[PDB]
Design a protein around this ligand. Structure first.
Ligand SMILES: CCCCCCCCCCCCCCCCCC(=O)O
Ligand SMILES: [Fe+3]
Ligand SMILES: [Fe+3]
Length: 217
């Protein structure tokens, strides 16, 4: 892969902006969760601080390839997930907030970052490797909490999945062209998100039929 073509820098302007905006949103979402879940404030504040470090690392990736991120593009990209998290937070829907951030968004990131790693430039590869090592703890936080509250959370989890999983599939379809320019196959991204997200639903307490039913939305 040639990291200095106009085609690569163009695609990267949007992808790098998307990760940066995603990291900033995760930082904000974990702080919002620290107010809704007072009991886990220290944990959630620590997760927010990892997200700041991720955001800084991906800013540095962009400057390494001399690419100015298209931050407007990114903000548009996340607007529906952002709006949904906020509407949930505004009503005290902790379970919906956890499903959007800790499960769906972290699964999306884990899938994507692991596909990027073997096609990234050396500097971005090292950064991304450290980020993805941390994103497993984010996912596990949500899995542990929702597992411990499963029966009481189950209905809300199903409704939040119906509402937000279709949003993530649009994002996945929308990024695919630029992701291909970077060397990332779309089918691998779809498959890896569905594996990661199904396994997360399994850990929280959904049976295999329910996972298949939910994966269908
Ligand atoms: C510069 C690194 C490029 C990485 C691979 C392509 C990324 C494709 C878009 C995926 C965006 C997920 C961002 C959400 C991040 C959530 C952070 C935490 O959580
Ligand atoms: Fe992150
Ligand atoms: Fe995260």
């Amino acid at each position: 892969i040639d990291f200095q073509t106009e085609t690569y820098k163009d695609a990267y302007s949007r992808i790098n902006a998307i990760v940066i905006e995603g990291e900033q949103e995760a930082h904000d979402n974990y702080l919002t969760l620290a107010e809704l879940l007072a009991d886990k404030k220290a944990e959630l504040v620590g997760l927010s601080k990892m997200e700041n470090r991720h955001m800084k690392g991906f800013q540095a990736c962009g400057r390494n390839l001399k690419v100015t991120p298209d931050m407007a593009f990114a903000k548009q990209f996340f607007s529906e997930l952002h709006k949904n998290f906020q509407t949930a937070a505004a009503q005290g829907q902790i379970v919906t907030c956890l499903l959007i951030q800790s499960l769906i968004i972290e699964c999306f990131a884990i899938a994507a970052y692991n596909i990027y790693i073997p096609v990234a430039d050396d500097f971005a590869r090292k950064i991304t490797e450290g980020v993805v090592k941390e994103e497993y703890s984010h996912l596990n936080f949500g899995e542990v909490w929702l597992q411990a509250h499963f029966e009481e959370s189950k209905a809300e989890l199903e409704a939040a999945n119906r509402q937000n999983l279709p949003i993530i599939w649009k994002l996945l379809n929308a990024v695919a062209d630029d992701a291909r320019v970077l060397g990332m196959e779309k089918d691998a991204l779809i498959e890896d998100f569905m594996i990661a997200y199904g396994e997360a639903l399994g850990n929280i307490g959904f049976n295999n039929r329910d996972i298949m039913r939910m994966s269908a939305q």
